[PDB]
Amino acid sequence: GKLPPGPRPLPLLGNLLQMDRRGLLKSFLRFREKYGDVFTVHLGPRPVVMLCGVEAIREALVDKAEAFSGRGKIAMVDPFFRGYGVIFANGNRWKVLRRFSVTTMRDFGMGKRSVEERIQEEAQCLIEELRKSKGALMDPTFLFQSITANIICSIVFGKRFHYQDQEFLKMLNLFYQTFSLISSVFGQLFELFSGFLKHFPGAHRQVYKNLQEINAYIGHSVEKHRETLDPSAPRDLIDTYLLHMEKEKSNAHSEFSHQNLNLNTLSLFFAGTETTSTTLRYGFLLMLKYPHVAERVYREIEQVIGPHRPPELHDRAKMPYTEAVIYEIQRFSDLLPMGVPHIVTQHTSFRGYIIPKDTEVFLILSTALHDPHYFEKPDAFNPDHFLDANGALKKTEAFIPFSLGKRICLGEGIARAELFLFFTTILQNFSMASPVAPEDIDLTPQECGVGKIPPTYQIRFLPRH
Numbered sequence: 394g395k396l397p398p399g400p401r402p403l404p405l406l407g408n409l410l411q412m413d414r415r416g417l418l419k420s421f422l423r424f425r426e427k428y429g430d431v432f433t434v435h436l437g438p439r440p441v442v443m444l445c446g447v448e449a450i451r452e453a454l455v456d457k458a459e460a461f462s463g464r465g466k467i468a469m470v471d472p473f474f475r476g477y478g479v480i481f482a483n484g485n486r487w488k489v490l491r492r493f494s495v496t497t498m499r500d501f502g503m504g505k506r507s508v509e510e511r512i513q514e515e516a517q518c519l520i521e522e523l524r525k526s527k528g529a530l531m532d533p534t535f536l537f538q539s540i541t542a543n544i545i546c547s548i549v550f551g552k553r554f555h556y557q558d559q560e561f562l563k564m565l566n567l568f569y570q571t572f573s574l575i576s577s578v579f580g581q582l583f584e585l586f587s588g589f590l591k592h593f594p595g596a597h598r599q600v601y602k603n604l605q606e607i608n609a610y611i612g613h614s615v616e617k618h619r620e621t622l623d624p625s626a627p628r629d630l631i632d633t634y635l636l637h638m639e640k641e642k643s644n645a646h647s648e649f650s651h652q653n654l655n656l657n658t659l660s661l662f663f664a665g666t667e668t669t670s671t672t673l674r675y676g677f678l679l680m681l682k683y684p685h686v687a688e689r690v691y692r693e694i695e696q697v698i699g700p701h702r703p704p705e706l707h708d709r710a711k712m713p714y715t716e717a718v719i720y721e722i723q724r725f726s727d728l729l730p731m732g733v734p735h736i737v738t739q740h741t742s743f744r745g746y747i748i749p750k751d752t753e754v755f756l757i758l759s760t761a762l763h764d765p766h767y768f769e770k771p772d773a774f775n776p777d778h779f780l781d782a783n784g785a786l787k788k789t790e791a792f793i794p795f796s797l798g799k800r801i802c803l804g805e806g807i808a809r810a811e812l813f814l815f816f817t818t819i820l821q822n823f824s825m826a827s828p829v830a831p832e833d834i835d836l837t838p839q840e841c842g843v844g845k846i847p848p849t850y851q852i853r854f855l856p857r858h
């Protein structure tokens with residue numbers, strides 16, 4: 394009749410003393426054992442409704458999109474974004490920014506390269522760089538960040554950066570450290586108690602600072618643009634927004650403001666860069682632990698593509714095994730285990746409960762991705778989770794690592810193309826080795842909070858001969 398049941402809170406502490414020391418997600422999975430798929434947790438002073446399992450999540454995001462489509466807060470970054478840019482925006486602002494971002498991430502103007510071609514050229518730059526590494530050990534993080542950030546960069550700024558550019562590396566380093574800090578134990582505590590903790594020093598200050606330092610670059614670049622801007626020939630997403638800006642300048646309430654410009658652009662870069670490269674980091678750790686899988690992908694690339702012709706999107710249809718392996722990397726690596734917080738926009742009835750306007754809601758995507766009815770032994774890495782008996786690709790409704798409904802990842806098409814083309818292009822040209830034997834490889838995440846972040850590891854890329 395009223396909110397969903399959950400553990401009884403204490404006045405200021407909420408459900409703190411019921412939480413699990415290992416983190417928010419562990420805490421929530423234990424509540425689920427007792428309360429089932431829909432339950433309430435008080436995270437300090439706020440009740441947050443948790444939805445688990447694909448059936449509840451889809452009922453909320455799809456069948457009740459008119460109520461579950463608002464965006465809630467990530468406390469570690471709210472002080473910085475303040476509801477600006479498409480990820481953190483609500484109401485009419487979200488509408489405008491979403492429609493703008495969807496269009497400009499897609500349509501580039503006549504003469505411009507498709508998404509596919511941008512990724513294919515980046516892949517060849519990447520392959521060249523790995524040949525130049527000559528089998529040396531590395532943590533591949535920076536390169537995985539380079540290649541994915543360069544995709545968004547080519548759309549937003551109209552250029553890419555060189556792998557050697559230390560100033561590019563420095564921004565990549567700030568994205569990496571920020572995503573870890575946000576996912577750390579402190580950042581999960583900050584989620585319960587930011588009203589109190591914000592008054593003291595902490596990781597929330599370092600994140601804020603990191604973000605402003607990336608934002609300073611974008612402001613500058615915005616200005617260089619607004620200086621060379623030719624209304625007949627827009628070069629990129631920044632010009633295109635400058636032109637909407639000029640068109641609506643007589644409306645003081647125009648959503649096309651400078652703050653939206655900077656923070657929308659920062660959002661696309663942060664999301665475009667950290668999500669994919671984190672998935673690739675996990676993916677190559679997985680190939681190190683399961684070399685028979687990597688050997689079998691390579692066999693499929695030989696047969697379908699060959700050793701030299703560059704992979705293309707058209708090849709996916711014919712490579713069920715590799716597609717299954719990429720799906721399973723995404724499913725197992727469970728990048729955003731609780732998704733990104735939503736917030737209900739109107740008073741609503743859910744499975745007999747009433748959820749008032751403005752209640753925060755977490756969609757625990759991890760529970761769809763590890764659902765034992767769709768994935769036998771869901772805690773093990775196994776590409777067979779996505780294959781039928783005939784070795785044809787088996788897609789399923791439990792695979793929602795981009796979420797669903799109105800707020801579904803807007804980068805989904807790009808991300809999928811990058812995973813496929815980067816992963817296949819690398820394996821076409823290199824096998825992998827490392828000093829750690831497969832049975833000693835530890836897949837345990839280095840952080841698990843808003844993001845699930847793999848540990849660091851060294852790898853060698855060996856040219857095939």
Ligand code: HEM
Pocket residue numbers: 464479480481491545660661664665666668669672728729732733734794795796797799800801802803804805807808
């Ligand atoms: C492995 C790759 C990616 C994953 C797993 C991923 C996952 C997600 C998830 C779970 C959400 C939250 C949706 C929700 O609130 O319900 C999201 C939102 C978003 N993602 Fe992705 N994303 C990925 C790649 C990208 C890329 C490459 C971009 C940029 C091109 C991107 C841009 C966004 C944006 C802008 C949102 C917010 C959309 C909105 O609130 O309207 N994502 N992503």
Ligand SMILES: OC[C@H]1O[C@H](O[C@H]2[C@H](O)[C@@H](O)[C@H](OCCCCCC3CCCCC3)O[C@@H]2CO)[C@H](O)[C@@H](O)[C@@H]1O
Pocket residue numbers: 542546560561564606607609610611613662
């Ligand atoms: O307010 C003072 C700030 O000014 C100087 O900053 C410059 C440094 O000259 C300059 O090296 C630097 O260039 C970085 C180029 C690489 C851009 C990478 C982009 C890729 C994707 C997302 C955005 C960043 O950007 C900063 C902003 O223009 C400094 O760099 C700063 O340390 C300083 O704090």
Ligand SMILES: CC1(C)[C@@H]2CC=C(CBr)[C@H]1C2
Pocket residue numbers: 470480575660663664667668729733843
């Ligand atoms: C999950 C997101 C939507 C994407 C990656 C990490 C995030 C936390 Br700042 C946001 C940007």
